[PDB]
Design a protein around this nucleic acid. Sequence first.
RNA 1: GGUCUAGAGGACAGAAUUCAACGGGUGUGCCAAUGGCCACUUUCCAGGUGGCAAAGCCCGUUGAGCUUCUCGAAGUGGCACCAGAACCGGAGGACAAAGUC
DNA 2: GACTTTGTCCTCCGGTTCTGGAACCACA
DNA 3: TGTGGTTCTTTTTT
Length: 1085
Amino acid sequence: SMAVKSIKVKLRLDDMPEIRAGLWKLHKEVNAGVRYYTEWLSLLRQENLYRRSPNGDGEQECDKTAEECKAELLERLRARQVENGHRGPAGSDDELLQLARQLYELLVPQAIGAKGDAQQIARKFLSPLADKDAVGGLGIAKAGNKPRWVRMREAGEWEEEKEKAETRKSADRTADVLRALADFGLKPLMRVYTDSEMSSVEWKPLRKGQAVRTWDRDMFQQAIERMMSWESWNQRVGQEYAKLVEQKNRFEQKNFVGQEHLVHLVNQLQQDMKEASPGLESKEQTAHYVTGRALRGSDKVFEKWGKLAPDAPFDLYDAEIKNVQRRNTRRFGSHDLFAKLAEPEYQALWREDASFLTRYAVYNSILRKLNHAKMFATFTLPDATAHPIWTRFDKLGGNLHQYTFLFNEFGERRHAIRFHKLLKVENGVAREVDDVTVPISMSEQLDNLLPRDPNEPIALYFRDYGAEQHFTGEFGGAKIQCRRDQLAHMHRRRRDVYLNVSVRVQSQSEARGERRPPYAAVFRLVGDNHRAFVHFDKLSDYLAEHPDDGKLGSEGLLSGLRVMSVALGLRTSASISVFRVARKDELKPNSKGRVPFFFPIKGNDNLVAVHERSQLLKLPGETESKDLRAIREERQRTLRQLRTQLAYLRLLVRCGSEDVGRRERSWAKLIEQPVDAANHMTPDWREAFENELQKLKSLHGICSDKEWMDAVYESVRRVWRHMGKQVRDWRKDVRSGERPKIRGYAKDVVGGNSIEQIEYLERQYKFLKSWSFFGKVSGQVIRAEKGSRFAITLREHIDHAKEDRLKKLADRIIMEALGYVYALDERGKGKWVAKYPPCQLILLAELSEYQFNNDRPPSENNQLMQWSHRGVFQELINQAQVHDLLVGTMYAAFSSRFDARTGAPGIRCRRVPARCTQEHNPEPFPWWLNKFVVEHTLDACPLRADDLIPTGEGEIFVSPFSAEEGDFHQIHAALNAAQNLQQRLWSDFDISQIRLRCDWGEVDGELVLIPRLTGKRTADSYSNKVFYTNTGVTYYERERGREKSVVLMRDPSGIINRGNWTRQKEFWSMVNQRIEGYLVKQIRS
RNA sequence: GGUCUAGAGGACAGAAUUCAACGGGUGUGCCAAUGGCCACUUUCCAGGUGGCAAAGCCCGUUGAGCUUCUCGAAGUGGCACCAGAACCGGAGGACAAAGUC
DNA sequence: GACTTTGTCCTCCGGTTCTGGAACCACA
DNA sequence: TGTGGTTCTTTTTT
């Protein structure tokens, strides 16, 4: 309910090693304490425990079975009765096992599916289960916090709340489980860890009537927490495994009931390629099964196959596959699958049902995910070094061992932390101490914390560049952490120790005693994706209650109503456009009296959404210039050289194969062509590679196999030893190299926080992995070992690079929504200034369904992981909680393919750079300009500067503006998608207004398209309607309500096909003809 | 100024363009930002493992030298930061064979 | 550079379920 | 504002 933030602080422990060894001893103690109580809970659970399987990661093994638990649990229970000196009844083995099971389901209610408070369960049971003289859990104790109804009865009156105490105390088996534990001699069930033989720490002597320390209560709660979440996963894994078995069986008899003979044929196919595969021997059950990845683009190949003869030769079937792949190499599947599907014995899989193979691929994916799906969540005990938990410290006033944050205890910015209880180690003995003050290393992050109240040293202020007034906050719990790498080590050194302090920060809305900000009642955020919906009823009165008064920054959140839409991307990290709700009684702007761009708002006819500003929120490094383009090519020069050199080394290794017909085919590829017509290799290594080739040419055929193969391997060593020194010097210049480094703030940097610079790092890791695992023997597989790490320092930099990009992206989006802009003065050299009124809502694109999938090509999944938009979406919700900013998503289908201003569909285009048209020193054409010149054969046509090139993926969106041939409307593709989200907000957009899915059928005697009713909006408009045709392309609605489905598209601007309902294929070709068809013809003249 | 609207910090093309003394400090990182030497990893490369060492790093002041202003002054650092444990998934990466633009 | 099938290792992105208290009364 | 036991709770990207 309140924004929590963690500021990790480092302890200066150089001058006091006895406390450093005490903090490390305390860490092993708490980890041992939690492990003791968690192990106890596992025995009370008396069910199977599963661990990670060694000798092969994937499946899981049974670490401890149920009988192993009950036997070990009874061994503890019987021994405890002896220790307690029980003279009464000892109870049957079945009685004790059931009693222990009853207690476990009270300790971890999630075992049976209930909810549980880890705080209160640990407080309620630790003493009654380990204190010899405990009276808690029963109804005897008079102490404790007063019930709800007592607080009501004294002030705030009661009747129903006193009832709820009894009727809940009725269903509380705690009192009886405790008395049953008492009658069996198990009154102390477990031991107090600090007061047992397990800890060698000389703890402070126990007070009278004390048996549990604050350290034990910390250990017990953290044992309940991990045991709760794990049980919640045991239930979740078993549930999701059950729905998988139901999915497998609900599918066979719901998709291909009458298509049983095709199922037997694809099974023959999947074992056909299984035997005839030259790859490694299969081991998986679903090996060589038909997957959706292998069928990528099968729709294009099948339609082109239907126009053929079943007895026709292969080459006309195969060359029709090559044409589909050439259309886009990225979105194509397996050539061998389509090659075997063209064989006449297998043609029935795609001839009868052209959608059966994709249907059966889904069945195979359910098969594979079921063979790997786990049935139980693995169980791992905490460990001081392997799976560490951290010693918590309550804030000042808390119930655990507390701490104070001492502002400026030793200097201007020299802060300190006083642990009221701690451990100290002097000459090997651990001793509990009181009131240890520990200074903190300098942290510029701590400069955002100011003390608020001297009498309450928990209070603080919180600074922020996007808040004119500082927030009020409180210190919270803290935890003592060490690094993970300094953890598995021991050595004999005096290991950095950190305190992770939790800071609770109160937002300006929360400071006014309001559950939600006043503008939250205007925007309905639904679901985990925060799908935004506008309450059009209420915004007519909100503007009356919250008029725009010009207050900037965080001070203007309660005045006006503004929404900022954000279009995330790779080239530009974010593209924004701000709109303002205002009456249509407006005027002309300050620049040159141009009627401002606005959108109509549904419901209110007096109010519109006026566009305020649009901006490209480029993170540093996402710019481009002549010198920047040169440096980025030079920074990867020697890398791209070594990458192509290694590729030819492998071609040389294959020549030493033991397979005649492999080395011969490999030796052919080496001598048939010149070595490096593209000049991608280095000069000297290529001269060495040419010396070896001409040496083997004077031996090929002349010599014998075991004498030619011996020379090929010896030649590999020289070239490998040679290129080895090259890789050595390249890395030397990478780490120690002296490259120019920016000082101060500066725009137009080489990499910065861009995707390219992270991939520049990723490219180095990918090559080094390919260089170390390079094999000198042809045919051998070289993988990493079962516990190895590779390029540890480089990998951590790559992750830190993405982590820094992610946080700076979210802050940039947030600082812009609030109306702050980082501007330069050169007398101040950069400072955040409030320039605009803030936006109350950040509208993103609904991209939760844009996930990594095996159906997507690996290059597309890779970009999705470099992008990681869902990570950006979660970091936005994190940083926005303090500023009272709402973040929501908008349905984003076709957001980049339709005009935001006009509504007409369009195509993403690029413009020809002037580097390729200048007569003085022109630069070569890029990849996209080549693919376009080739498709339409424009080799002899002179391109001009800023010529539009329709590529389907550029940064310039182009749409037909009217029926005039050549009349276009051009705008930034990202900003066009951002404004499209805004247009869809104020109009309550639904996809049924532009696209519809239908199926054929009879209604009034004729064949018509019956639209699929998806969502209440589609049912509200098209349930009672149906679509007819006279030509099969353009459909018209009626009023009465093949085998594949038909998707109809619609131009809301009426420019393309008069805005009638058009079949999807021909619709986008009309879009293509009116844009691409025009641009090609004007170029040809 | 050319191209394109959203008329904005507008967007595409274009043209244009740092030592050492002393003192203090080194939370997590990034910005061209991936530390150095030795030894081992059988071999020389990569990668890993260990050891060693001095610092390398900012900040402040004082000098120099650079690089722009006016008829000597200024400028030689900026940025972001909500975490913890366990778990279940999703997918990349590398190697070998084979087949493909 | 882009694409597929076979296995096996290191890594990364996404999401889940717990969490990072509050307060009363006898103490001696 | 002590502690320690106790109760507190119902398509999109490029």
